[PDB]
Design a protein around this ligand. Structure first.
Ligand SMILES: *C(#N)C1=NC([N]C2=[C]C(F)=[C]C(F)=[C]2)=C2N=[C]N([C][C])C2=N1
Length: 215
């Protein structure tokens, strides 16, 4: 794989979003992955709807949490592969109240046919990302509440409790790192991103990696 990749440089990543006081990170991880894949599949970059998942995916638990892998199955199995646009199903859960699902009236912004779950191997995740684009990952984010910048190297790595998006890596750096998009606005971290060391399973980053398949 190349020494360094950053899918932001390809224009493939939407702006950093704001989940607010809702435990909807899993939705932001899944939808951000879809946004990137939809762009890479030859379409304009389009903001897509987290609220569709938070309100309508009853396999997951709204503001109480969820899993990207379940979200991807819901999209395909329950929603005909459709992911609505942000504008047509906008984010309403920032104050912690998810509105009831509505099935009528939204605009499809992307279509997926499935998703992949990657091996629990940072090298193989990086090699897949280098070719195919950003990867949704579960992490232990419990050490992230003081991060102001730099490469984090000794994160608590004990329990998956958050979902985020790998957008790149740098193996050349003095401490090799992953580049991760969060959903805590651009006012946290490095304009909304965190670098964690790569190669030591920091934050349990290799354990639950996946990506949508556009089709
Ligand atoms: C977010 N925000 C969030 N996530 C989880 N759990 C989670 C998310 C994920 F993407 C992958 C995982 F393995 C685990 C939450 N569990 C509780 N809460 C607060 C309601 C969570 N928020």
């Amino acid at each position: 794989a190349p020494a360094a990749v950053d899918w932001r440089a390809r224009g493939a990543v939407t702006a950093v979003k704001d989940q607010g006081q809702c435990g909807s990170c899993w939705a932001f991880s899944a939808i951000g992955n879809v946004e990137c894949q939809w762009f890479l599949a030859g379409h304009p970059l389009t903001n897509l709807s987290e609220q569709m998942l938070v309100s309508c995916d009853k396999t997951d638990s709204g503001c109480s949490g969820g899993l990207m892998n379940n979200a991807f199955e819901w999209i395909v199995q329950e929603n005909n592969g459709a992911v609505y646009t942000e504008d047509s199903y906008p984010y309403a859960s920032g104050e912690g109240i998810s509105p009831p699902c509505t099935t009528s009236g939204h605009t499809v912004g992307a279509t997926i046919t499935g998703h992949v779950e990657l091996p629990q191997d940072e090298a193989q995740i990086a090699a897949w990302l280098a070719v195919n684009g950003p990867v949704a990952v579960a992490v232990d984010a419990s050490s992230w509440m003081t991060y102001t910048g730099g490469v984090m190297t000794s994160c608590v790595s004990e329990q998956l409790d958050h979902g985020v998006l790998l957008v790149g890596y740098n193996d050349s750096a003095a401490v090799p790192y992953w580049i991760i998009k969060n959903s805590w606005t651009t006012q946290w971290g490095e304009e909304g991103y965190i670098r964690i060391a790569k190669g030591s399973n920091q934050c349990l980053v290799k354990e639950e990696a996946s990506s949508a398949v556009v089709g």
